[PDB]
RNA sequence: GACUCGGUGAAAUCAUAGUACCUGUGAAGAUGCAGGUUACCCGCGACAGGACGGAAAGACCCCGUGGAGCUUUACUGUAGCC
RNA sequence: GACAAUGGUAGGAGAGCGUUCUAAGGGCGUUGAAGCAUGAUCGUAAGGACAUGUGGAGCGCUUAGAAGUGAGAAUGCCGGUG
RNA sequence: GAGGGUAGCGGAGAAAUUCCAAUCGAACCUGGAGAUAGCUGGUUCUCUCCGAAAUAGCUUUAGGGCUAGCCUCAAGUGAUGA
RNA sequence: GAGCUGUAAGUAAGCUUUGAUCCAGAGAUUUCCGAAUGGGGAAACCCAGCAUGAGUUAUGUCAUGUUAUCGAUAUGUGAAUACAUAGCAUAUCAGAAGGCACACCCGGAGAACUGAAACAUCUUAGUACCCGGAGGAAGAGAAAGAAAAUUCGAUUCCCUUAGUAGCGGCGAGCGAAACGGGAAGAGCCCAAACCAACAAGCUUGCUUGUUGGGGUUGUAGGACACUCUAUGAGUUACAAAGGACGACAUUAGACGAAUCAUCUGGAAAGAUGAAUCAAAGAAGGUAAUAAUCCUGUAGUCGAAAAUGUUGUCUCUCUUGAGUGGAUCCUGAGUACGACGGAGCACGUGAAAUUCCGUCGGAAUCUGGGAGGACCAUCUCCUAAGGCUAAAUACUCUCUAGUGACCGAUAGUGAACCAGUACCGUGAGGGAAAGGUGAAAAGCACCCCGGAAGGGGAGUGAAAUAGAACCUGAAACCGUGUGCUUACAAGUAGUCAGAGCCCGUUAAUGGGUGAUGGCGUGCCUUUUGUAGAAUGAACCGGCGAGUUACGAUUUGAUGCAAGGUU
């Protein structure tokens, strides 16, 4: 269950096996974004803010259930399992190394 | 025989299995399996309770 | 108003239909059957003899061990009154 | 190889196909499922197939069960179109 | 013209069976209620075998019913049937 | 534990690790109408009084308390009448009213359609409507019982007794009970004699009215006398009542094991191969069909708080056994009877038991009843006063589930901002209407047109998937076409057969038809129908011997003078 400033891999998608960042994840929708994954052009029209607006590209949403994950010492893609030490719980990549990967 | 603590709580995942105390013996799994492997000491009971 | 042209545009009805007349037969009054006779295909304007034309599961008549309303010295009861 | 019998209503008696679901066994399915359209094929009937298009995801076949099981008429009901 | 009253076994009537929310020999709306109907209409897939009656008796019975008569499968008896 | 500001995209400012928004417990707020209650009233409004207070120099205004009716408790006052009572005036109290799922129950009141092949006694049925009162269950209930042998024992409910005994215009039809097998198992408090105060009459007497205490049953218990026992049991639902000391269950949530690679594909969860967990191969989601991708499951944990079960102790409470019965009490206009009537399965009949109405009306332990009238003998039990858990009946909901249950004309009427549009003055009726894709990527731009629409381009695997949107059948209205038709008599075909055009699931081939024979559609209903008898405009969809309980019959299968729950 990932969080806004990790860095994974895909599984299933049209580009699949590229890494990348997540910057929002629509947690009512569950569908996260990653940069360079499934660019979807639009056409919008000249607005009252884009003077004569037109094409461009940019990547949308894709699901959870693609994404995995990866494990830092390693890079190889892992479930990630909790356990907790003191007063908060922390992630454990479930490969024996916990990562850091929040900020 | 009567119980078991693990073979009725073992065996309970595997497709095909089906594990039965010997008083509760019906006859529609008697018939769906096609192998009998009971225990020595509910095999002299059958008899002594169906016969 | 009907009629012709431009505008808009319903309805009851309807087994399928390219739907003639005579004499006869027939559930005894035929656009459909037999035998004749007469008629090329196609529409508009009218007329009302048929299609047992449409409209209402005939009110007339008769049935139901069918209901209602009314009457009386029909039967059994009852509110009141002596 | 014979030998006989086989029109048919009300109604009585047998053998049968198909539709939906479950149980068990055994399969086909993005190299294209169920439905939809078309075809000169197969069985004695109800019906069964097989290619080709359209279709984009869940179906058959054998055995055996249980039933909301089959459509052309009720001045039927509802939705469409004349 | 404005306010008001009388409600179904009831009310109103210069009496006609008129009026009571386009009606009335007893209003409407629910519930008993899928009332009852000896009466009309309707009842859906296929093929083999056999296949009648429209009469008798009695009925508040004559278009209804019950029994005998006439058909049908299943057992028997088996020479009684023409 | 990182995003949020409803359903709801768009904004535009903002909030957020200093812990938001959401999930659970607890508290404060809770305008106005509603039993409406200060008076009115067309519900969601209007008009006030009484004290306090703001305010203005005051009057107008405002603000929070306050005042309905019965009922109870306290004084005031107290007539026609003089003594008191109705009456009257103040102060406290929160008792009531209304609503409910009215599903289930208990009493009051109570029809007809229908069956008998008509109909009045009967039955549909003490059913539906109406009204009253409570509960999570109500009613019943501690023998004036059943029974007939040897008796056993409160009430309720399930199975058999059994469609039997019986009732009935002896017709239609109603229809028990005990014994037996089980479910779940508690029995108790008042009245009276007698005794101790209190008051009264009216005296050391008696009677009467309260207060305790004593006492509550039939193998006859109690009063009164006799003798002997006590800080051990019983309990806050019956038996008298409140409350601190201490284990679980609810109301949020944690953790939670196991996988890769290629191929076709827009995309794999599919195919082929190589692996792994399993107390986890329930279920759903993810671009197709996933045990190992996500949410989960098996198994484990958690609870500041607030309720419910509750175990323990603490408290209240509390004497129980025997004998003598030589006297005294045991539920009065009651039980019964006469008269009309309802209920008991039982229609007044041979009619007990049971309650109501009117009227007469007993005896008391040698009593008093009841054993289907009544009398005799014998067995059983003690009315006219109260209280009571469990077995059992229900779901408008709440929690977790399951289904040879439906998949949009089905399923609730209602999947869709449903009892809504809409019709009715009213009470009340009461519809239609689901699906783009994996993702909004929802067609930038160019062109004709005022726009609507449209052709290109473009996104997308697919726009022949364009927001009337998956799939798109029939009626029906159309477009060029191969054969054919203007001397013809027609339930529209079928069987012969010429000519011209096309070549098949390749078979005694498909379409068209100049001309000859043959011929009055279908279903219901009938002695009979083309019928001028009925029914259908056409095409879709929906739409009619079913189920439970029994009885008799053949077919099947166990066992055999035995079979069976
Ligand atoms: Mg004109
Ligand atoms: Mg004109
Ligand atoms: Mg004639
Ligand atoms: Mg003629
Ligand atoms: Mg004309
Ligand atoms: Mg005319
Ligand atoms: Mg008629
Ligand atoms: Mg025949
Ligand atoms: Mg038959
Ligand atoms: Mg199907
Ligand atoms: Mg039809
Ligand atoms: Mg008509
Ligand atoms: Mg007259
Ligand atoms: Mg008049
Ligand atoms: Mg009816
Ligand atoms: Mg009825
Ligand atoms: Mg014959
Ligand atoms: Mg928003
Ligand atoms: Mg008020
Ligand atoms: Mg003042
Ligand atoms: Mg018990
Ligand atoms: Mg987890
Ligand atoms: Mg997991
Ligand atoms: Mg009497
Ligand atoms: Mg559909
Ligand atoms: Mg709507
Ligand atoms: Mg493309
Ligand atoms: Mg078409
Ligand atoms: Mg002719
Ligand atoms: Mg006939
Ligand atoms: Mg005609
Ligand atoms: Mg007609």
Do not use: C, W
């Amino acid at each position: 269950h990932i969080k806004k400033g990790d860095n994974v891999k895909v599984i299933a998608g049209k580009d699949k096996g590229k890494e990348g960042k997540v910057i929002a994840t629509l947690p009512k929708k569950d569908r996260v974004v990653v940069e360079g994954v499934n660019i979807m052009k639009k056409h919008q029209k000249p607005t009252q803010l884009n003077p004569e607006g037109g094409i461009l590209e940019t990547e949308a949403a894709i699901h959870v259930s693609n994404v995995q994950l990866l494990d830092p010492k390693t890079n190889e893609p892992t479930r990630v399992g909790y356990k907790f030490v003191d007063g908060k719980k922390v992630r454990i990549a479930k490969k024996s190394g916990e990562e850091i990967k929040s900020n | 025989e009567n119980e078991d603590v693990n073979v009725e709580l073992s065996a309970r995942n595997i497709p095909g299995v089906q594990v039965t105390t010997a008083q509760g013996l019906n006859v529609l799994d008697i018939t769906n399996a096609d192998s009998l492997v009971i225990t020595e000491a509910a095999a002299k009971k059958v008899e002594e309770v169906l016969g």
